[PDB]
Structures are given as C-alpha cells and as structure tokens.
C-alpha cells in the first residue's frame, strides 16, 4: 500500500497520505477529518485486510491524523506513483505540485495561496491551509500533495471536480510530522 491508495474505515473511504516512520515503527498520515471518526483501518472494501489503528487526530483547526500499522507483512511502499518521497518542505506560491488520491488518481497544478482559512460549515473551520488549482473529489481526502521527492500536504477539501476543474486545500504536512515525531519515506 502506497500514498494515494484507498483506506477504509467502518463507515467509508479516504486515501493514504504518506507512509512515515519513527525508528523501526511504521505509520501512515491521512486527514484528520478521516481519523476523527474511525479507529480501525482496512486496505480493502470488504474490511478484512487490517492496516492499523488511529493513534492521533487533529480536526478541525488543523486537518491531519495518524494511523499506526498493526499489519506487519503488508508492503508499506515509500513511493508515490513512481516518485520516492524522502523529505518534507513548506509550500510556496507558484510551486508545482501533484496530488494522488483513491477517487481521482494523480492530478497536478500549482500552489496559489498559503495560510488559507477554509470553512466546511457546522463549526469545522481549518486554518493554515495550502490553496491550489488541483482538483479533487470525495474519497481523495488524506492523500499526498508532493513536489519531486518532497512531501508538501495532505488533501483536505475544496470545490469543483476533476471533470471541469477545481480548487483544493491541503494541510501542510510538516505540522503533522512535527506533532507526531515521524519522518516521511
């Protein structure tokens, strides 16, 4: 399993962000609005190949979370599409970025704004977001935003779609890495 692939909770589907480590311990990052209501994660829609258990969730205000792997034998790939991901960086306006997710696959664009505040309604406001002209659709949440070998963000939400175009906002990954004391690979 790799960044951008489907992950399933008891209620629905999101996308894996990045695979991460602290020493010999493996985890993955995803969106906080995905981990908020989900303890166990599975790799398959049948909900029989366990991935692991949520260990941290931050949503709203932020939108990031973390799941520790309990499945010792599943492959935990370190690439996104063919791309190695070995470090994290901050977004900058104009940076070229690619997202992968389990609804729409791989789509690219530019960073168009930093530190955006995004109101999802119902009290769920997120701050500090990267805005982009990349499209996304429901189920893509949590998937990686990258640029070359650098992790940049985790898919949060947006408007539009991948048929006619959209605007998608991402949680910067660096804050999740720091919060959880892990490193992307």
């Amino acid at each position: 399993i790799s960044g951008g692939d489907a992950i399933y909770s008891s209620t629905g589907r999101c996308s894996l962000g990045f695979n991460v480590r602290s020493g010999s311990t493996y985890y993955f990052l995803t969106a906080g609005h995905c981990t908020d209501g989900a303890t166990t994660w599975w790799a398959n829609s049948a909900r029989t190949t366990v991935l692991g258990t949520t260990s941290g969730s931050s949503f709203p205000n932020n939108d990031y979370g973390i799941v520790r792997y309990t499945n010792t034998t599943i492959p935990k790939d370190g690439t996104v599409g063919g791309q190695d991901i070995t470090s994290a960086a901050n977004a900058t306006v104009g940076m070229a970025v690619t997202r992968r997710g389990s609804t729409t696959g791989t789509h690219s664009g530019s960073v168009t704004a930093l530190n955006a505040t995004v109101n999802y309604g119902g009290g769920d406001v997120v701050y500090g977001m990267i805005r982009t002209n990349v499209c996304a659709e429901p189920g893509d949440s949590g998937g990686p935003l990258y640029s070359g070998t650098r992790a940049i963000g985790l898919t949060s939400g947006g408007s539009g779609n991948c048929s006619s175009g959209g605007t998608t906002f991402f949680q910067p990954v660096t804050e999740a890495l720091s919060a959880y004391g892990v490193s992307v690979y």
């Binding site: 947006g158 998608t168 906002f169």
Partner: peptide, 4 residues
Amino acid sequence: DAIY
C-alpha cells in the same frame, strides 16, 4: 468548500 467541502471535505473530501
């Protein structure tokens, strides 16, 4: 905007 809407969560994905």
